[PDB]
């Protein structure tokens, strides 16, 4: 679990990315401003 | 808080400690004054012979009596936590010998001051400097350095002392003191200041057993 | 003294399993209560 | 005397009940008057519709 200090968050981010019809980039995915 | 206790308060001290399997217990009855920053302390040993000398016992054996002027009353901590209780833990590192690790709580039990001191001295050599009894009956004025740490909102003291050896040398030892108040009332965080203290050591000729008489004058400057 | 405490907790687990089976058949006991009176 | 100490504990209990009712009631009154403002805004919207 040496990956797991940085690893579970991009896995659930990829799981959110795979089930979104907008399909945004990581700059839109991390930053808390609303953007379409 | 302790502004009504500016006069003479009777001071009872309870010192229990062990140094390489040697049991000693020094107790004493004395008084301290705040309006004039002085202390009249007469300490009488009950066990008898002292394994540790009296310069290594004085800093452990009541800094709430400092003569304070009107310009530094805001930067005083020791009249805010003393009724609630004032627990201090010290790390005194002697050069080329062991270390003093003591637990002392300065709180008002009943009406008199009761100082429950629990000391532990580890890694000491008997043929060194402290335990060979080469310390004379004298003390040097020491400027206690006080800085405030906001992680546990307390008082940390980092200062050094000068102990006079009989053969013509000096002892360099540094204090690492951590002070923890008990109550959660009005706490005051001061700036960096120092206590300009001086001490006089004399002996009472009208006493039979091993006794220690200390005279202490505490003054403050810096802010 | 450890083995007596271990078999004490084993009897506690056995009493927990017996009272779990008792709470499983209890609906039928309350149906038998509703059959009477 | 005892009347002064009874006044002391009555004043502390009156302060305790007053700031307890104030802390427990002022955001409750904020929520209640926000509901009254929203209900009267919906009433004026219904009067615009009717």
């Amino acid at each position: 679990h040496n990956v797991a200090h940085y690893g579970w968050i991009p896995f659930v981010l990829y799981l959110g990315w795979a089930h979104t019809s907008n399909r945004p980039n990581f700059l839109n995915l991390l930053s808390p401003l609303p953007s379409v | 808080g302790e502004e009504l206790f500016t006069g003479v308060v009777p001071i009872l001290v309870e010192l229990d400690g062990d140094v390489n399997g040697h049991k000693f217990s020094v107790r004493g009855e004395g008084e301290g004054d705040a309006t004039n920053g002085k202390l009249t302390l007469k300490f009488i040993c009950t066990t008898g012979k002292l394994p540790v000398p009296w310069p290594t016992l004085v800093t452990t054996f009541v800094q709430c009596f400092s003569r304070y002027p009107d310009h530094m009353k805001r930067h005083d901590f020791f009249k805010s936590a003393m009724p609630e209780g004032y627990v201090q833990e010290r790390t005194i590192s002697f050069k080329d010998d062991g270390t003093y690790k003591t637990r002392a709580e300065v709180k008002f039990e009943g009406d008199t001051l009761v100082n429950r001191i629990e000391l532990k001295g580890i890694d000491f050599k008997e043929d060194g400097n402290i335990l060979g009894h080469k310390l004379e009956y004298n003390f040097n004025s020491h400027n206690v350095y006080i800085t405030a740490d906001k992680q546990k909102n307390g008082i940390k003291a980092n200062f050094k002392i000068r102990h006079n050896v009989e053969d013509g040398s000096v002892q360099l030892a540094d204090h690492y003191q951590q002070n923890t108040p008990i109550g959660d009332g009005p706490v005051l965080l001061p700036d960096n200041h120092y206590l300009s203290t001086q001490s006089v050591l004399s002996k009472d000729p009208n006493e039979k057993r091993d006794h220690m008489v200390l005279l202490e004058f505490v003054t403050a400057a810096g802010i | 003294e450890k083995r007596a405490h271990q078999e004490q907790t084993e009897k506690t687990l056995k009493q927990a399993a017996y009272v779990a089976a008792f709470l499983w058949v209890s609906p039928m006991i309350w149906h038998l209560v509703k059959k009477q009176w | 005397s005892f009347v002064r100490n009874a006044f002391t504990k009555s004043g502390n209990l009156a302060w305790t009940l007053t700031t307890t009712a104030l802390l427990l009631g002022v955001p409750l009154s904020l929520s209640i008057l926000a509901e009254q403002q929203l209900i009267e805004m919906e009433k004026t919207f219904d009067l615009q519709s009717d």
Binding site: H5, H19, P32 | - | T9, L13, L23 | -
Partner: protein
Amino acid sequence: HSHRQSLELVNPGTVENLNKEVSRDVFLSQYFFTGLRADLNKAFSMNPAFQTSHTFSIGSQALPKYAFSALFANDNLFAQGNIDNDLSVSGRLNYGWDKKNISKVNLQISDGQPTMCQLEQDYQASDFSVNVKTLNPSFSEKGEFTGVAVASFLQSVTPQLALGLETLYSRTDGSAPGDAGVSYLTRYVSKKQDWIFSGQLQANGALIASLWRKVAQNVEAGIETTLQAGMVPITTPIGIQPTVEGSTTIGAKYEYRQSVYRGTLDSNGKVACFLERKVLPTLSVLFCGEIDHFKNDTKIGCGLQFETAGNQELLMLQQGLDADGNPLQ
């Protein structure tokens, strides 16, 4: 074998959700903070929750300084990953084999402390719910498993009242045999669904009894007790003596469409309040305050819960509008 299905019994709730109407819906135990607590959240999708969550906090020992939580739900798998400041990652994966059967594994690395894991399998039926969890599981060199294992079973013995039990086994040091404790749970649900009662005689004697009452459509109110029992020595001490610490809390909750109120009175003189006013459909300000009358102290924390989207139609759906711009029914 015959009349167990003939009663058509109601499935009770989970043992973790036994006091959910009292402790979570009404009370202020899970909802209190100190200092500013900004909680910026943005949901990318509606069917998949995909709720990104930034948290900024100061002045609270429990709350992290920065907390980034990504939550994905596809209606059969639930995943939450929260990276706290100091690189502490806490991820929970709840997978459902059925709607009845849900298995949840929670991991937390703390980056300088031992990793804390919880493995749970939860089963529901027509009449009974069995939850088996282990907190910090490990396997020893021997057959015994070091860790805490809690298995709890609750069955509706009547339609109104459900009775149940909870077994805790603790194997912390490994060399000693573990301690086992049985708790008894009781949930009386009214036939009008007005007031429920949740009693719980715990393993350590903590008699937690709670009542929840829904007086109207917008206000509920509850009252719990704690009654934790334990032998405390008096002033080496001479001996020990049982001194049960008891505390009774009574709270109310006002659920309006623009604001949420939660207000508790305590046995210790701990008066607490919590208002979440949704001053925008997106941004909702919250204030929580606590006056501890026993120590004459207070703790007041304000903050906001920002809520936005990452697509156009959920951005309009948060504002009550369609993607064409028409307001919804």
